[PDB]
Paper text:
The Mad1‐Mad2 complex, which is required to catalyse MCC formation, is targeted to kinetochores through a direct interaction with the phosphorylated conserved domain 1 (CD1) of Bub1. Mad1CTD is comprised of an N‐terminal elongated coiled‐coil, followed by a globular head domain featuring a conserved RWD (RING, WD40, DEAD) domain. Each monomer contains a long N‐terminal α‐helix (α1) forming the stem, followed by an antiparallel β‐sheet of four β‐strands (β1–4), a short helix (α2) and two C‐terminal helices (α3/α4). Bub1CD1 is largely a single α‐helix, consisting of almost four turns.
In each case, the asymmetry of the homodimer was retained. In the more asymmetric complex, there is a more marked difference in Bub1CD1 peptide occupancy, with high occupancy for the peptide bound to the concave side of the Mad1CTD coiled‐coil, and very low occupancy for the Bub1CD1 peptide bound to the convex side of the Mad1CTD coiled‐coil. Electron density map of the second homodimer from the Mad1CTD‐Bub1CD1 structure (shown directly above) from the P21 space group visualized in Coot. The occupancy of the peptide on the right is extremely poor as is the density for the head domain it contacts. Thus, this peptide is likely to bind with higher affinity and to represent the single binding peptide in solution as detected by NMR, ITC and AUC analyses. This model is supported by our Mad1CTD‐Bub1CD1 structures from various space groups where higher occupancy of the second Bub1CD1 peptide correlates with a more symmetric Mad1CTD dimer.
Residue numbers in the entry:
A (entry chain A), C (entry chain B): 597 to 718
B (entry chain C): 460 to 477
D (entry chain D): 460 to 479
Write the structure that this text describes.
């Protein structure tokens, strides 16, 4: 009713759908970015609850098949592949691309071409 | 759009390049 | 009433702190997340101000070498490769992996292994 | 951690795990 109260009601309204159009814009954009990265690179990339990175291939044979990478160091980005039920099945690719070449891109590339070549058209 | 949407779009788009 | 004023003043303060908390958390997570995608996939993906996806390889032979993809429409994820200077130099990857195989992941995987294997010490 | 932080972390982490 009073000017000082009328003004403070505008200020909460303004801050309400300043945060509420902030969340709905983060959400659309994050999902757009993450989806583009799915369709282009053929990996869903999640931040886990342990702040680690989970990768699931578009050509995954089973739906729970995934790779988990931890950020070793804050400074830039080195990453360690952690052990999953699926990482057990690609020791060949780990030896050639992670141990010897020291290239996660080269590894994930090889892995995408190996999984993609298993997809039946039927 | 409306103004608060635009204010929101300004902040986010900055970080999705470089 | 001064009860309205005090209550509305908390609400303004509270909403303004949530917005600041939201902005500084988001900024931190997208930068870690965008750096995570680059280290793992070997592609910097950025949403161009025309809402298209510009891709730069970690193994790009020249600075300014990049691929641009356009989303067909928000519904689903089919995307079109747009003309860039770099696109002209990989007509064979495009023929084999985009036209014949209809797989952007296969394409980006083939390209990555091609660029990686060209990157020599001398 | 403070309450608004915990509230903010909860919403953004949800976004970084959702299927596509």
């Amino acid at each position: 009713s009073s000017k000082e109260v009328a003004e403070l009601k505008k200020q909460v309204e303004s801050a309400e759908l300043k945060n509420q159009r902030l969340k709905e814009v983060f959400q659309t954009k994050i999902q757009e970015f993450r989806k583009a990265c799915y369709t282009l690179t053929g990996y869903q990339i999640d931040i886990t609850t342990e702040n680690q990175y989970r990768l699931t291939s578009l050509y995954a044979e089973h739906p729970g098949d995934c790779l988990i990478f931890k950020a070793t160091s804050p400074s830039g980005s080195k990453m360690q592949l952690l052990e999953t039920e699926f990482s057990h099945t690609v020791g060949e690719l780990i030896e050639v691309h992670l141990r010897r070449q020291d290239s996660i891109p080269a590894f994930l590339s090889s892995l995408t071409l190996e999984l993609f070549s298993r997809q039946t058209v039927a | 759009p409306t103004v608060h949407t635009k204010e929101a779009l300004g902040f986010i788009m900055n970080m999705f390049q470089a």
